[PDB]
């Protein structure tokens, strides 16, 4: 039931207009400095893979992955960059859907 909500939240996030930086993993070989700064990478397709095989035992574990996506994005990207702008927008969206459910 809680994970039921997580499926919907993930679909809406995947379908959001500001989702474009977060649909596939950052390839550390293609981004200078990414591996040295981000130890716990996360993205929506990785969350989708885990959710599909029942790898989230609680909604809390889903929320940890979602915030990793946005925390990694704020750590590595400036607020003024297109990717930075997108992470701030998706965090507010996630925080809005998460609070009108949990």
Ligand X SMILES: CCc1nc(CN2CCN(C(=O)c3[nH]c(C)c(C(C)=O)c3CC)CC2)no1
The phi and psi torsions of 42 (rounded to 5 degrees) equal -155, 150
Helices assigned H by DSSP within the chain: 2-15, 34-37, 44-52, 59-76, 82-99
Which parts of 25-84 interact with ligand X (CB under 6 A)?
26-27, 30-31, 34, 73, 76-77, 83
Token pair of 40 as six digits: 């716990």
**3 vs 48 by CB, closer to ligand X:** 48
**30 vs 57 by CB, closer to ligand X:** 30
**3 vs 19 by CB, closer to ligand X:** 19
> How many of the chain's residues bind ligand X (CB under 6 A)?
12
């Amino acid at each position: 039931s809680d994970l039921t909500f997580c499926e919907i939240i993930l679909m809406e996030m995947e379908s959001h207009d500001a989702a474009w930086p977060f649909l596939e993993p950052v390839n550390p070989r293609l981004v200078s400095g990414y591996r040295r700064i981000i130890k716990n990478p996360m993205d929506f397709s990785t969350m989708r893979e885990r959710l599909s095989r029942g790898g989230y035992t609680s909604s809390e574990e889903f929320a940890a992955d979602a915030l990793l996506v946005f925390d990694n994005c704020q750590t590595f990207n400036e607020d003024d960059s297109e990717v930075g702008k997108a992470g701030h927008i998706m965090r507010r969206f996630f925080e809005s859907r998460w609070e009108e459910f949990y």
